[PDB]
């Protein structure tokens, strides 16, 4: 006990904390290992995802090497602050912290061969720009970028410890509106004016779930358009009936579009769902204009040719519109 | 300090995103990674057909020009990475 105490104090003694291991020698080599716990809500409005993980950095420091005391020591909160650790940081994070309750979720373990293992429990909100042009039929690519802040590749090299097995816990993710199709681990040397900095990238590919939108967006619009087509089969002299039908279908379409864009994320630029809804709106508007033409031509100014043409052309045109939309966006 | 900031902080994971570099001469280089929320008064009378001018004002808190003098290092090439800026 006291032997361990005085040996740890001696290990602290003679240690320069501002100097990395092997300052004049070859660069330090740090192996990263991530254990994902969960991916929380993913925001289209903010274009970011919140990720919780256990982040581990493994390296070798000959300064912190001891002989005897076969057990591997474990510094916890106070003397841990008196050791050099890499200045690793997440390039694209927007807000992150180490969990505090009950105690600081940090760990430092020193093996007798000078090896150091530094574990942290980190929650981080990372930026993920999204291509919301095929929304809700879109597929996204989010990334987490890990980089050294001050040291270039000549001083520190990073790598994935364990190779492709470095990152674990991907299966634990249970996002409601997204499914993780694939993930990748990449290592690069980004070149700045100062020099080549190390970089690691943990990338996920997400595919959105579509049945929600099929249930609440595409089906009601199609049903409302089919209802709007009923005017062509209603008698042409039923002015109040046909006018009420057409204008109320238009009102229902506007109601659907407005409340849909209220409940959906803001997303202040064009999507695919907007084009589909606008197509349905134009179809019902054209149906009402068709009745207006009928009323002016006949009964104003043996079914009539205008309605006979409408009955066959409107479903046919809507089918072609659906075909073009689905082929273009799928 | 940033005279127009409403909330600012220096990112602190895993360590505090700062940096100091010294050279054989007396020069010192000091880097920080900073996120700020800066006020930008908008003339939205022509919204949505509007054009806005946003600004970031950098100033000393208690030193006059007799003590400290600022300048953009590199002139028009001082600020880099504007092409990375993309908004919807």
């Amino acid at each position, epitope marked *: 006990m006291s032997f361990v105490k005085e040996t740890v104090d001696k290990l602290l003694k003679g240690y320069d904390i501002r100097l990395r291991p092997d300052f004049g020698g070859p660069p330090v080599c740090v192996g990263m290992n991530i254990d994902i716990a969960s991916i929380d809500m993913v925001s289209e409005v903010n274009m970011d995802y919140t990720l919780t993980m256990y982040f581990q950095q493994y390296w070798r420091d000959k300064r912190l090497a001891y002989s005897g005391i076969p057990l591997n020591l474990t510094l916890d909160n106070r003397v841990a602050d008196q050791l050099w650790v890499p200045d690793t940081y997440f390039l694209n994070d927007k807000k992150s912290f180490v969990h505090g309750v009950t105690v600081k979720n940090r760990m430092i373990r020193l093996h007798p061969d000078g090896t150091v293992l530094y574990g942290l429990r980190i929650t981080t909100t990372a930026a993920c720009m999204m291509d919301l042009r095929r929304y809700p039929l879109d597929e996204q690519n989010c990334t987490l*970028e890990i980089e050294s802040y001050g040291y270039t590749t000549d001083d520190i090299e990073f790598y994935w410890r364990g190779g492709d097995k470095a990152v674990t816990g991907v299966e634990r993710i249970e996002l409601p509106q997204f499914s993780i199709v694939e993930h990748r681990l990449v290592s690069r040397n*980004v*070149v700045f004016a100062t020099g080549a900095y190390p970089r690691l990238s943990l990338s996920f590919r997400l595919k959105r779930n579509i049945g929600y939108f099929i249930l609440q967006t595409y089906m009601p619009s199609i049903l409302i358009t089919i209802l709007s087509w009923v005017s062509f089969w209603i008698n042409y002299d039923a002015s109040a009936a046909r006018v009420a039908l057409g204008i109320t279908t238009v009102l229902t379409m506007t109601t659907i579009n407005t409340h849909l864009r209220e409940t959906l994320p803001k997303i202040p630029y064009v999507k695919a769902i907007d084009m589909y809804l606008m197509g349905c709106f134009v179809f019902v508007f054209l149906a009402l204009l068709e009745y207006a033409f009928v009323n002016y031509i006949f009964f104003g100014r043996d079914v009539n040719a205008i309605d006979r043409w409408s009955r066959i052309v409107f479903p046919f045109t809507f089918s072609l519109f659906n075909l073009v939309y689905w082929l273009y966006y799928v | 300090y940033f005279l127009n900031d409403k909330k600012s902080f220096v990112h602190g994971v895993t360590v505090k995103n700062r940096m100091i570099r010294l050279h054989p001469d007396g020069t010192v280089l000091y880097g920080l990674r900073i996120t700020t929320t800066a006020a930008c008064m908008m003339d939205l009378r022509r919204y949505p057909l509007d054009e806005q001018n946003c600004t970031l004002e950098i100033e000393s808190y208690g030193y006059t020009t007799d003590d400290i003098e600022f300048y953009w290092r590199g002139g028009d090439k001082a600020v880099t990475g504007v092409e*990375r800026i*993309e908004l919807p």
Partner: nanobody
Amino acid sequence: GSLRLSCAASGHTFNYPIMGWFRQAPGKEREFVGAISWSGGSTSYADSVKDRFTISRDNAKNTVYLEMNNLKPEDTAVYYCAAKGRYSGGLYYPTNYDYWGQGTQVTV
């Protein structure tokens, strides 16, 4: 007079937003000339070709136009267009660019 060079991109263009132009004259190293962002504008140019070349993009068919003007005899080289990710680093360094095109020759 005025030479227009069009670089057409096909594939996952969103993951590689920035496009840059490089020139390699025979026996000389590859050198950056200019760069264009994703949403158009924010054009950057090298000092040697400032106020002479003007890059632009319409994204009608995912095409980037160099629109090379005020052509000088020193401005002869193999011109390449390259793609750069959202987090790759500086614009002026060829190593930061992932994919390079075939390259087009201009000799005048």
